[PDB]
Design a protein around this ligand. Structure first.
Ligand SMILES: CC(C)S(=O)(=O)NC[C@H](C)c1ccc(-c2ccc([C@@H](C)CNS(=O)(=O)C(C)C)cc2)cc1
Ligand SMILES: C=C(C)[C@H]1CN[C@H](C(=O)O)[C@H]1CC(=O)O
Ligand SMILES: C=C(C)[C@H]1CN[C@H](C(=O)O)[C@H]1CC(=O)O
Ligand SMILES: C=C(C)[C@H]1CN[C@H](C(=O)O)[C@H]1CC(=O)O
Ligand SMILES: C=C(C)[C@H]1CN[C@H](C(=O)O)[C@H]1CC(=O)O
Lengths: 85, 32, 257, 85, 51, 51, 51, 51, 51
């Protein structure tokens, strides 16, 4: 059907988070994996960039073990940047 | 166009010319 | 466009290029003329032969040397002769073969090379600068273009110093004439054909058009004139009025035409 | 300074609407103009596409004179499509 | 030789249809994007067997 | 065109030549392709080299 | 040099010559914009061709 | 002329040349980093090649 | 032919020859990874060069 960048973002953050939840306590290790799975499920305009790139970066640098919930809650509002390149 | 002016390369054939003429002068001399 | 939107004019008739940005604000009648962004350069000078082009392949040193060699062979023969004639024959053989080969190389090189084919070639070389007008549909096209070649060209043009952009068409053409073919002017095919048909006729258009678009007569959105004007343009198109008109102003009275 | 396509979308719809409000009864005629102003104000990842393309199309095809409010209210949730193409 | 006349094809819509202006603007967008050019090259030239 | 005027189809996309007679009944989007009437012949198998 | 060039050019008869010869017959489709163009044409050459 | 052709260069230059000719077919592995590189590539030449 | 094509001659003295000749002096920067590479190098040639 039709693509929506906004819907893609809101889906992206949620799928990333829900993915990281199974990985609790190792959470800081798996950010990119879960970001891959989320980019797959929510789709992306550029396969390299992913659904939301800025959120991924924010999570990667912020997320600490077991600190997940607060980290995600802080990072989910973050600007995704340009989903072209 | 790349103007050639190949004079260096032709110079050798000029040299074998001069050599041939030298030997020619030699034969002309030994004859007379 | 401004006069049309703000109602200072009821209609706009001019070589107005049809663009999406303009189609959003105004209404464009069906295109009355076809054009495209094209390349204009200075036509290469036909010939400057002299008598020197004959002495070009064989160096001046070789001519002096072969003259002295000639008189040397003569004075050697003046003083056995078989090897002289043989050696001289071999000598002049190598020389005529060399002259033939070198001249062949000259003509081959001259017939082999072409200055410019398309726009892509312009993108691939830094030797010949090129540019467009300070404003208008061509510049905007290059700016907004996501296509590789055109993108590269825009980056180059905007970044290059001194500025490659000109204020008027006549200025750009003048720059084409003065630059000895070091400057190329990007302008719509129409203007290119027109300038190419006017004396001194030192300028020419190379390759095809970068894009395919057309001019049009513009009317304010929701104006009563729009449909009559459009249908009229169609009438003129089918009747051949447009063809005959273009031939009238462009080609027919062309001095070099 | 990231653009964040979702924020870009909300801005796009908002600026289009606020612009069309100035033109009463002519709303269906000025859709593209106001969309131009909105693409200018909110920025765009692709200058051709604009901030939100699907919303623009939705408005153009839906909006009728004096029908502004409801039409916009219906069109503002629509998917914007591909912002890079 | 050349072409006898200069004309073009088009997408046709009923007069007063809602689709008309969107279709038109779409054709313009596709035109500047080079979609028309690339498509024509796709079907005509690219697979062209005559060289 | 008939299908469009009499409402059996909402849109027509095809190599439909734009004509005034057609432009009177329906609406044409800006032309998506340019063409013209041209002549097609059989290509000569060879060309005489000449003296 | 000529032999190294290997350039081959193919001449054409264009449109104007075609009106002037009876040797090569020529035609268009049974209907459509081309036939209609020739029919309604007030231009000399095309007129002759139509006749 | 013949010997000029013999010592004449430019049989093959770049990757772009493969994109510019349909005469010589070319390919990659059924899987692995190369195919995926061509797949996800947004840059012109490689994109064309992938298509 | 060979005049039309011309040619290019590319010589290489490589690395070891610098170790084999005292005619051409050679050196590196006062500091940095290159100098350190030559210093700690356990390879014969580079060792000699450093010496
Ligand atoms: C702005 C673009 C969307 S576009 O220009 O409309 N389409 C691009 C496409 C390649 C194209 C571009 C130009 C033309 C075109 C064809 C013919 C003419 C003139 C000679 C006749 N006008 S007309 O429109 O065909 C007539 C029937 C009145 C002028 C322009 C046809 C197709
Ligand atoms: C001559 C001028 C300034 C006009 C004519 N057509 C283009 C236009 O309609 O904007 C402009 C030229 C160009 O920008 O290529
Ligand atoms: C292919 C056909 C029958 C169509 C296509 N364009 C022309 C048209 O739109 O009338 C017709 C050809 C022609 O008239 O020779
Ligand atoms: C040999 C294979 C299948 C491997 C080796 N390196 C690439 C890789 O690491 O995926 C693959 C080759 C390729 O993709 O061209
Ligand atoms: C310029 C300097 C001192 C730097 C640059 N790269 C090397 C480095 O990053 O150490 C050094 C050069 C060298 O060691 O020859």
């Amino acid at each position: 059907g039709p693509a929506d960048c906004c819907r893609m973002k809101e889906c992206c953050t949620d799928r990333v988070n829900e993915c990281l939840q199974r990985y609790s306590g190792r959470e800081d290790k798996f950010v990119s994996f879960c970001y891959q799975e989320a980019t797959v499920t929510c789709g992306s305009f550029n396969e390299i960039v992913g659904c939301c790139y800025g959120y991924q970066m924010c999570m990667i640098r912020v997320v600490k073990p077991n600190s997940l919930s607060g980290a995600h809650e802080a990072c989910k509002t973050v600007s995704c940047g340009n989903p072209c390149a | 166009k790349t103007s050639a002016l190949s004079l260096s390369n032709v110079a050798g054939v000029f040299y074998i010319l001069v050599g041939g003429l030298g030997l020619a002068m030699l034969v002309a001399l030994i004859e007379f | 466009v401004g006069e049309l939107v703000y109602g200072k004019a009821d209609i706009a008739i001019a070589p107005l290029t049809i663009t999406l940005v303009r189609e959003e604000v105004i209404d464009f009648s069906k295109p009355f003329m076809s054009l495209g962004i094209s390349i204009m350069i200075k036509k290469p000078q036909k010939s400057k032969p002299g008598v020197f082009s004959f002495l070009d392949p064989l160096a001046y040193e070789i001519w002096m040397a072969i003259v002295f060699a000639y008189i040397l062979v003569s004075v050697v023969l003046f003083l056995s002769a078989r090897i002289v004639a043989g050696v001289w024959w071999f000598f002049t053989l190598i020389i005529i073969s060399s002259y033939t080969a070198n001249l062949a190389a000259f003509l081959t090189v001259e017939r082999m090379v072409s200055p410019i084919e398309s726009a892509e070639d312009l993108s691939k070389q830094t030797e010949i600068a090129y540019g467009t007008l300070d404003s208008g549909s061509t510049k905007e096209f290059f700016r907004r273009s996501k296509i590789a070649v055109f993108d590269k060209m825009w980056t180059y043009m905007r970044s290059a110093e001194p500025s490659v952009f000109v204020r008027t068409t006549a200025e750009g053409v003048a720059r084409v004439r003065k630059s000895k073919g070091k400057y190329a002017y990007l302008l719509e095919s129409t203007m290119n054909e027109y300038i190419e048909q006017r004396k001194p006729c030192d300028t020419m258009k190379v390759g095809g058009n970068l894009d395919s678009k057309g001019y049009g007569i513009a009317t304010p959105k929701g104006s009563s004139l729009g449909t009559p004007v459009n249908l009229a343009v169609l009438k003129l198109s089918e009747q051949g009025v447009l063809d005959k008109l273009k031939n009238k102003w462009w080609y027919d009275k062309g001095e070099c035409g």
